[PDB]
Amino acid sequence: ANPCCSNPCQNRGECMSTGFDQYKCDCTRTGFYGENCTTPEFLTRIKLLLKPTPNTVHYILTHFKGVWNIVNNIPFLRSLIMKYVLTSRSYLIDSPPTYNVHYGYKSWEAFSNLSYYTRALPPVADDCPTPMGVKGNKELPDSKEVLEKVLLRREFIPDPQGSNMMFAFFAQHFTHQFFKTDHKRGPGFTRGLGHGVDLNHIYGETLDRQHKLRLFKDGKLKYQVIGGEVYPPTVKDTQVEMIYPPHIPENLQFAVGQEVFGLVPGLMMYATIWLREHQRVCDILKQEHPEWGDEQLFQTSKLILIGETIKIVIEDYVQHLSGYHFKLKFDPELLFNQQFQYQNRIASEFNTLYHWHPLLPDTFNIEDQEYSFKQFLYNNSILLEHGLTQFVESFTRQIAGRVAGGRNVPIAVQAVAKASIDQSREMKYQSLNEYRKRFSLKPYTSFEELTGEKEMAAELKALYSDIDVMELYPALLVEKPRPDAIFGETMVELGAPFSLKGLMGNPICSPQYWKPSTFGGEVGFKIINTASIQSLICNNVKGCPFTSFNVQ
Amino acid sequence: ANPCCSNPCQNRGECMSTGFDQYKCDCTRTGFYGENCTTPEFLTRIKLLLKPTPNTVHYILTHFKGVWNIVNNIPFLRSLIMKYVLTSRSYLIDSPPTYNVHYGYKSWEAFSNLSYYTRALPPVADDCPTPMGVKGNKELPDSKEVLEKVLLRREFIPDPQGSNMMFAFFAQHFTHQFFKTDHKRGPGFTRGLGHGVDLNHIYGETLDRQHKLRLFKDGKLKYQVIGGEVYPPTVKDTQVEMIYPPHIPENLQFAVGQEVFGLVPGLMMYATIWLREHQRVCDILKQEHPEWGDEQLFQTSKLILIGETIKIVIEDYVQHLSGYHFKLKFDPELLFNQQFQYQNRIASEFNTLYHWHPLLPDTFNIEDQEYSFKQFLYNNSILLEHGLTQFVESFTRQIAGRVAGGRNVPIAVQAVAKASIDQSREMKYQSLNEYRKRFSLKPYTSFEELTGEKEMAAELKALYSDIDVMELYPALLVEKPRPDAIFGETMVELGAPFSLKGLMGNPICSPQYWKPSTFGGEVGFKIINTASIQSLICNNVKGCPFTSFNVQ
Ligand code: HEM
Ligand code: HEM
Ligand SMILES: *[C@@H]1O[C@H](CO)[C@@H](O)[C@H](O)[C@H]1NC(C)=O
Ligand SMILES: *[C@@H]1O[C@H](CO)[C@@H](O)[C@H](O)[C@H]1NC(C)=O
Ligand SMILES: *[C@@H]1O[C@H](CO)[C@@H](O)[C@H](O)[C@H]1NC(C)=O
Ligand SMILES: *[C@@H]1O[C@H](CO)[C@@H](O)[C@H](O)[C@H]1NC(C)=O
Ligand SMILES: *[C@@H]1O[C@H](CO)[C@@H](O)[C@H](O)[C@H]1NC(C)=O
Ligand SMILES: *[C@@H]1O[C@H](CO)[C@@H](O)[C@H](O)[C@H]1NC(C)=O
């Protein structure tokens, strides 16, 4: 009933109800005035003209490999480039944070409550006429239906980018320190109050936990030597609570530091690689500092490891996932002379668009056998029986599924995408078009425009009817992959702003933290400065197995 | 034993131990190089030359009243000035946060743990030779002694600035939302996790508390009408826990929202003025928005009230306390085109230097009687017996004590200043000279230089011996008042940076929040934009009693 229901306020302006039937727009600092923040300010026009389309840039970025190579070799130039991408990307996200599940308005409660996931777009008034506002029907397409018609995988489609198993699992582990829904509270609630890259998944959510995980000696994390290799310690010994099916014989209930990481040997693989990497930096710091004590060694390592993580996530993981030609660089300084908030709050939207279940294949082939989900899930023995070398080897070579494009959701993880559809529903999310407009993208004129193909398009049109009523999660998967890539524009445009904030806006990236001393010396500083997914494995895996986020 | 013990690293560089006996300095971005970050970078020299002394500026600021008057009338100019003060002040504080009670090094634990108070200077190694580092003796001057010789008040010295009772109590109330030590944990620990101007003291620390305080109707806070006036509701009714002596008859156990505010009618006076100011804004918003609901009315008011509080604290409280001639202005935009972190963490140092007990007189004279501490403390009846009009009138006229200068600590609140001395001791604080250097101030060459007089000076010298061993708290009080002012340079230079951060670096000050809509319209926006201590009382006190933070 609320006049704002129809999302009248265009151009990022703010709608406020002003008397039951009438509403008002806060066109403040938008660059547009008038009833709906519709008419641009003259200078706005100037910018609007020059604005190259993301795809144009995308082309230009993905092409000219040689021109690009010159750039990658003129430091002054590269950094110069790195900066641009770094800034532009950020004017898009809200910092400090604004809305959420419950607050369509700004409120202190919203701003202060760290248990919520922030929201990039306000939810929809519970008193509106239709779930997407005013457009659509008393209801939305049946979930189970949308799930089956355009989502579920028939024949495994591989990723045309080469993303292997080392990658898909890395992204699972990585995002799983910040995406940690508090189901007991509801979706929209995170249990990772850190709201960012805090390596909580390695260390424990709380100091109480972290302490049950630490050896308190040379700063080392606790661990055990099975066979001749190092593995996380027993839940039995450390007493840390972990999630494990009753049939697990204990004795294999690995501790780690993120309760759920015991349900997929792909998590635990990495969770043992980083455990291994902790002690490693310890022994390095401890050499360099004969005079340091346990707690300092520890505290400094957790910092370097975060340094590495951000290093690897920008220069390998994102670099790959982008398919850019221009080498992205992790250099905290490009921002040192820019306005930039070193704070971050994970948005449910980011949590949502990151439901990349399509990466999963149908069997997990660890050099010699192929296992089903039913054989992989909650089964350490596999990892203990295969070792990490012949696990890194096997995953380096094993393409993963395309995410965007169409029907590639594993019927196993089907229960999941169904839920994903249902939750965003309950979290009163908004139109996919709205989000497109929000991230300065032009809205799809037809389901057919969204898909690029026509079977699904018309198949969707069957249920959604108006494109301006098509949801966000589905269309993210049921969408037209840009060239031979894994995602479509929408997924690339909503996620990149979200990703470079929680990555760049981290305390260790702030001027007061960015310097040798913070990390234990010039040594530990370069540890961060030379991190790579190849080195992570090299130093920690049995025989410097070659690796990459690409199935060669 | 730690080589860093002697605080070798000058110019804001960072000392790091490098092998038991050797240490190393992180002169990064200091503008100085060499073993102790001692030798300046050429350009550093240039700036160093032009650097006018704080006192020069102080002079220039406090004089030329007519020149200043022209400025206060050329908008473009004033704002221009307001900006400079605004920025310079800030390059001094650490954001994001660094050290604390337990962490002399940066650590994630430090950065993440919101229960700690941040520290502007690291504590001193527990393994150093002397409590101030290496200078001094196995011990420090006896507290009890320092307390008596240069601190305690003999004859009440009034403030040469005019600070009345309205002011002293305002500052108690105000700072008491952010200064809230968790004694159960220890000094250094805050229970105010909000770390800033969150009006928690009006609303309650937790949502569970805020809920016991709210009427849930037109957004209004719960209250009661005694006589013909409005007063906070009973602890009996709301059930909110508050701190009250067993002899209190209940029936007067006012609720309010900050457990301790029930032990001084000066707190509760204001605590009732703001309660009254809440409902007021509600009724305004509820007029303007016939269509709003309880929770929205509520949430918007708490925002406007924070807007008012920041407005009043900058343009009245700070403006007065400064004695400037130039009118300070609260305009969030002066920063809109500056690098500025909209985050904040209260430092124990700020908590310490704010122990302004000297403001207190010896009797509280509420128009007709004079009460002793023993009669004022935990006694509402006074407030209820006198009313707020003849409480505002009585306080507007009743000078408060000078803080800096010498021996003006009430023998009642003596237990306190002793503690203050003992705690900064346990929190392993640093030399007053160190802090002076930290805030770009030249260190005192003699106890004599610190005091400006000679009885105390020589009296201090008796115990401290080296000026480079004199503590922070004492010397803050035992110090030379700049002209006819209440504080000395040290107190003005350490606090102002600390104050404008937590004031300006507030979400409602950030571009996304700074606009009409955030506050319910253009009405609620001007409520913030026209706030004044005169209006706070006018609108909420029985007969628009004239007020000010000055005993006329
Ligand atoms: C290896 C097998 C995997 C299984 C069986 C699995 C299963 C699930 C399940 C049960 C949920 C909860 C969904 C809900 O109830 O809303 C979930 C969430 C999620 N999964 Fe997976 N997943 C797997 C792999 C991955 C991978 C490789 C990624 C990497 C992008 C991924 C990313 C996510 C994300 C982002 C969430 C949301 C996390 C949260 O908010 O708690 N998953 N997955
Ligand atoms: C009106 C009578 C007042 C009384 C009886 C009083 C009493 C006290 C007491 C008992 C403490 C606890 C000290 C300790 O155990 O460490 C204290 C702390 C403090 N007082 Fe007052 N005070 C009064 C007024 C003021 C005023 C006007 C100010 C204004 C600056 C002030 C500022 C402080 C501060 C900053 C603290 C530390 C707060 C904390 O960390 O918990 N006090 N005062
Ligand atoms: C604003 O949008 C409303 C529909 O919500 C429309 O009726 C009105 O004419 C629009 N006005 C302008 C100036 O865009
Ligand atoms: C956050 O807000 C919800 C209600 O608004 C509350 O139930 C939850 O406990 C809050 N969390 C905290 C830490 O206050
Ligand atoms: C788990 O792996 C072990 C060894 O690789 C195997 O014996 C077991 O059958 C697997 N579990 C399932 C459910 O396949
Ligand atoms: C730095 O301080 C050390 C004492 O810790 C002193 O020996 C050395 O000469 C100093 N050097 C400079 C350049 O200040
Ligand atoms: C804060 O940190 C200290 C140790 O670093 C810990 O003992 C205390 O319990 C922590 N508080 C919280 C709320 O984590
Ligand atoms: C409290 O105030 C009343 C009236 O102002 C006074 O009669 C009474 O003695 C006071 N109580 C104490 C303990 O001083």
What structural domains and CATH numbers belong to chain A?
1-41 (2.10.25.10), 42-552 (1.10.640.10)
Q: Quote the radius of gyration of chain A (alpha carbons, Å).
A: 24
Cβ atoms A392, A541 nearer than 8 A: yes
Give the Å distances, CA to CA, from A115 to A179, A429, A515: 12, 19, 32
Residue A316, Ramachandran bin (φ over 0: left; ψ between -120 and 50: alpha; else beta): alpha
User: How many angstroms does the Cα of residue A252 sit away from the middle of ligand 5?
Assistant: 13
DSSP character at residue A151: I
- The answer to whether B353 touches B476, Cβ cutoff 8 Å, is yes
**Can you list the alpha helix ranges (DSSP code H) found in A200-330?**
200-203, 207-213, 235-238, 265-288, 294-312, 319-322
What are all long-range contacts of B528-533, with beta carbons under 8 Å and residues at least 24 apart? Answer: B528/B304, B528/B307, B528/B308, B528/B310, B528/B311, B529/B307, B529/B311, B530/B311, B531/B307, B531/B308, B531/B309, B531/B311, B531/B312, B532/B311, B532/B312, B532/B315, B532/B316, B533/B166, B533/B170, B533/B312, B533/B316, B533/B317
Q: Which residue from B98, B288, B512 is facing A94, i.e. has the nearest CB?
A: B512
**DSSP collapsed to 3 states, A433-482:** HHHHHHCCCCCCCCHHHHHCCCHHHHHHHHHHCCHHHCCCHHHHHCCCCC
Give yes or no for a contact between B153 and B234, defined as CB atoms under 8 angstroms apart.
Answer: no
User: Pick the catalytic residue: B354, B429, B464, B473?
Assistant: B354
Q: Tell me which residue has tokens 């110090």.
A: B479
Q: What is the enclosing helix (H) or strand (E) of B303?
A: helix B294-312
Residues 317-346 of B with CB under 8 A from A: 337-343
Q: Judge contact between A403 and A487, C-beta under 8 A.
A: yes
DSSP state of A225: E
A229-231 and A224-226: which strand pairing?
A: antiparallel
* Other CB atoms within 10 A of residue B224 CB: 14
Q: Where are the beta strands (DSSP E) in B120-226?
A: 224-226
Query: Cα–Cα distance between B472 and B306 in angstroms, integer?
Result: 32
Buried b (16+ CB within 10 A) or exposed e, B250-280: eebbbbbbbbebbbbbbbbbbbbbbbbbbbb
CA B372, B374, B379, B381: dihedral to nearest 10 degrees?
Answer: -50
B521, A306: Cβ pair inside 8 Å?
A: no
Structure tokens at A63: 């092409």
Other residues' Cβ atoms within 10 Å of the Cβ of residue A60: 14
| Tokens representing residue B413 in the block | 């609140």
A119-A124-A129 Cα angle (round to 5): 170
Give the residue among A229, A144, A96 at the shortest CA–CA distance from A422.
Answer: A144
- From B130, B48, B35, select the one nearest B431 (Cα to Cα): B130
**Separation CA B104–CA A86 (nearest Å):** 32
Contact assignment for B341 to A342 by CB distance below 8 Å: yes
Alpha carbon nearest to ligand 1 atom 12, residue: A416
Instruction: Name B217's Cβ contacts closer than 8 Å, sequence gap at least 6.
Output: B294
Q: Do the chains contact at A517 and B109, CB–CB below 8 Å?
A: no
Cis peptide before A361 (omega within 30 of 0): no
Whole-angstrom Cα Rg for chain B: 24
Closest ligand relative to A384 C-alpha: 5
**HEC profile for A20-39?**
CCCEEECCCCCCEECCCCCE
Q: Residues 481..510 of A with a Cβ closer than 8 Å to B: which?
A: 507, 510
How far is residue A324 from each of residues A81, A393, A491, measured CA to CA in Å?
12, 26, 16
Omega within 30 of 0 (cis) for the link into B96: yes
How far apart CA B298 and CA B286 sit, in angstroms, is 10
Q: CA-to-CA distance for B167 and B56, rounded, in angstroms?
A: 27
Three-state SS at B118: strand
Position B15, amino acid: C
Length of chain A: 552
Q: What ranges make up the beta strands (E) of B259-367? A: none
Integer Cα distance of B93 and B25 in angstroms: 20
Pairing, β B32-33 against β B15-17: unpaired
The technique by which this structure was obtained is: X-ray
Q: Which atom of ligand 3 is nearest to the CA of A7?
A: 5
Identify the bridge partners of residue A17 per DSSP, sorted by sequence position: A23
Question: B56-92 b/e with 16+ CB inside 10 Å = b?
Answer: eebeebbeeeeebeebeeeeeebeebbbebbbebbeb
Q: How far is it, in rounded angstroms, from Cα A307 to Cα B486?
A: 47
Tell me which DSSP letter residue B454 carries. S
The end-to-end CA distance of chain B, in Å, is 56
How many CB atoms neighbour CB B472 within 10 A? 24
Surface of B (191-220) touching A: CB under 8 A: 194, 198, 207
Cα separation, A34 vs B60, whole angstroms:
46
Residue located via tokens 């309650």: B204
Annotate B463-508 with DSSP letters as a single string: HH-SGGG--SHHHHHSS---TT-SS-HHHHHHHHHHHHHHHHSSGG
Q: Are B408 and B358 in contact (CB under 8 A)?
A: yes
The DSSP code for A541 is S
CA distance linking residue B201 with residue B192, whole number of Å: 9
Q: Mutate which of A18, A24, A291 to disrupt the B interface (most B C-beta within 10 Å)?
A: A291
B173: nearest Cα among B194, B213, B201: B201
Is B191 touching ligand 7 by the criterion CB < 6 Å? no
B115 lines ligand 7 (CB under 6 A): yes
Please state at what angle helix B265-288 crosses helix B165-178, rounded to 10 degrees: 70
Detail the DSSP E strand segments found in B7-130: 15-17, 23-25, 32-33, 39-40
Contact A404, A479 (CB under 8 A): yes
3-class SS of residue B244: coil
| CA pair distance A220, A216, nearest whole angstrom | 7
Choose among B482, B462, B483, B464: nearest CA to B472: B464
Whether B354 is catalytic: yes
Residue with CA closest to ligand 6 atom 1: B36
Instruction: Determine the distance separating the centroid of ligand 8 and the alpha carbon of B246, expressed in angstroms.
Output: 15
CA distance A449 to B79: 51
Question: Can you tell me which residue has the tokens 């950065």?
Answer: B111
| Residue A229 CB less than 6 A away from ligand 3 | no
The residue to which tokens 């996931």 are assigned? A117
Residues of A whose CB is below 8 A from B288? 18
What length does chain B have? 552
Other C-beta atoms lying within 10 Å of the C-beta of residue A211: 12
Cα dihedral A338, B105, B427, B406 in deg (nearest 10)? -50
Q: Which are the contacts of A174, defined by CB distance < 8 A and separation ≥ 6?
A: A309, A313, A317
Q: What is the DSSP string of A54-78?
A: HHHHHHHHHS-HHHHHHHTT-HHHH
**Beta-ladder partners of A118:** A347
Dihedral of alpha carbons B127, B132, B135, B140, sign: negative
Question: Among B15, B220, B17, which Cα is nearest to B99's?
Answer: B15
Q: How far apart are CA B540 and CA B283, in angstroms?
A: 13
Quickly count: other Cβ atoms within 10 Å of residue B448's Cβ: 16
Q: Please, is A295 exposed, middle or buried when counting C-beta atoms within 10 Å of its C-beta (0-12, 13-18, 19+)?
A: middle
